[PDB]
């Protein structure tokens, strides 16, 4: 048995951008109010209040090449 | 048995952009109010209140090449 | 048995844009009010209140090439 | 000649308010763009551009009593 | 000749307010852009650009009593 | 001739306020851009650019009593 796995990639993933800028992300500019009275909890509580886990991501490229090779005999 | 696997890729993924900008994301500019009274929870509670997990993503390219090559005998 | 898997790809995925901009996303500009009284929960509670998981995605390209090659003997 | 100018004022101007609040004034939230080319002015120019002279006035009373007394012989 | 000018004021100008608050004034949140080319001015120029002369006025009373008493012989 | 100018004022101007607070004034949160090319001015120029002369005034009273008395013979 002869297996010849010889794939060729000569590709390019390219971007050209001018000025990249004047980006505004303002999550949670509004007032947040939480009032709790006379609550019973009999198991685990998880609570997140306010402005959490928000992302601003501005890469000058941000191009991705993903390439998977598998050979199984 | 002879198996020859020679895929050739010469492809291009390309963008050309002028100025990229003047982008505004303002999630949750509105007031958030939560009032709780006399609640009972007999099992697990998860709570998120406010402005959470919001994304601003402004890549100057953001091009993707996704490629997969499987040979199984 | 002879198998010759030799596909050729010369393709291009291309964009040209002028200025890309003046983009506004304002989810949840309106007031959110939640009042809860005298509620019983006997099993798990998940709660999201406000402005969550909103996305502004503005790629200068955003072109995708997706390509799967499989050979099974 | 006898003049007896004897007006009596016992009046009240009264206000009762609960909570006064949650007031939003956002004038000129929109983008303003002015382009001028090749203009000739042979007399005085006055120019206002943007967000000018806006008022938010929130008096807890704001009651007015205005009272003029005149006697001319 | 007898002139008696004996006006009596026993009046009240009153306000009662609860909490006064949660007041937002955001004049000129929008982008302002001014481009001028090749302009001639042969007389005086006055220019205001941006966010000017805006007022937030929140008096806990703000009650006015305005009173005038003129006698002329 | 007898003139008897004897005006009586026993009046009051009053406010009672709860908490006075949570006041936000944000004039000129937006970007200001001014570009000038090849301009001629042959008389006086006055220029204001940006965030000027904005007022936040939050008096716990702010009540005014204004009272004018004139007698002319």
Give the DSSP per-residue string, A9-53. Answer: E--EEEEE-S-EEEEEE-TT-S-EEEEEES-EESS-EEEEEEEES
Of the candidates E2, E21, E3, E8, the one whose C-alpha atom is nearest the C-alpha of residue E59 is E21
Separation CA B1–CA B23 (nearest Å): 59
DSSP code, position F57: E
The position carrying tokens 């697990």 is B44
Query: Are the beta carbons of C59 and A63 separated by less than 8 Å?
Result: no
Measured torsion, CA atoms of residues B68, B71, C3, C7, in degrees rounded to the nearest 10: 10
C50 reaches A (C-beta below 8 A): yes
- Tell me the structure's resolution in angstroms, rounded to a single decimal: 2.2
Separation CA C14–CA C19 (nearest Å): 16
Separation CA B61–CA B14 (nearest Å): 8
D30 reaches F (C-beta below 8 A): no
Separation CA B42–CA A60 (nearest Å): 50
Query: Are the beta carbons of A27 and C56 separated by less than 8 Å?
Result: no
Separation CA A36–CA B9 (nearest Å): 61
Joined tokens for residue B22:
């003047």
CB-based burial label for D48 (10 Å; 0-12, 13-18, 19+):
middle
End-to-end alpha carbon distance in chain A: 11
Query: Are the beta carbons of D41 and E43 separated by less than 8 Å?
Result: yes
- E-strand ranges in chain F read 2-5, 8-9, 12-16, 20-25, 32-37, 40-41, 45-52, 55-57, 64-72
End-to-end alpha carbon distance in chain F: 11
D61 reaches F (C-beta below 8 A): yes
Joined tokens for residue E70:
């003129």
CA A58 to mean position of chain CA atoms: 12
Separation CA E9–CA D71 (nearest Å): 17
**Which chain E residue is nearest to residue F56, measuring alpha carbons?**
E56
Query: Other CB atoms closer than 10 Å to residue D19's CB: what's the count?
Result: 13
Query: Are the beta carbons of B72 and C69 separated by less than 8 Å?
Result: no
Beta-sheet pairing, B20-25 with D32-37 = unpaired
C-beta of residue F11 within 8 angstroms of C-beta of residue D13: no
Of the candidates A23, C68, F24, F28, the one whose C-alpha atom is nearest the C-alpha of residue E25 is F24
Beta-sheet pairing, E8-9 with B45-52 = unpaired
Separation CA B31–CA B49 (nearest Å): 11
D27 reaches F (C-beta below 8 A): no
Of A53, A59, A67, the CB nearest to B53: A53
Strand (E) or helix (H) holding C32: strand C32-37
Instruction: Using DSSP, state whether C15 is helix, strand or coil.
Output: strand
Of the candidates C59, F45, B52, the one whose C-alpha atom is nearest the C-alpha of residue A46 is B52
Query: Are the beta carbons of B26 and A26 separated by less than 8 Å?
Result: yes
């Amino acid at each position: 048995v002869q297996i010849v796995y010889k794939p060729v990639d000569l590709s390019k993933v390219t971007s050209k951008c001018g000025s990249l800028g004047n980006i505004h992300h303002k999550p949670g500019g509004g007032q947040v109010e939480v009032k709790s009275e006379k609550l019973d909890f009999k198991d685990r509580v998880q609570s997140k209040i306010g402005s959490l886990d928000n992302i601003t991501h501005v890469p000058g490229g941000g191009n991705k090449k993903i390439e998977t090779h598998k050979l199984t005999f």
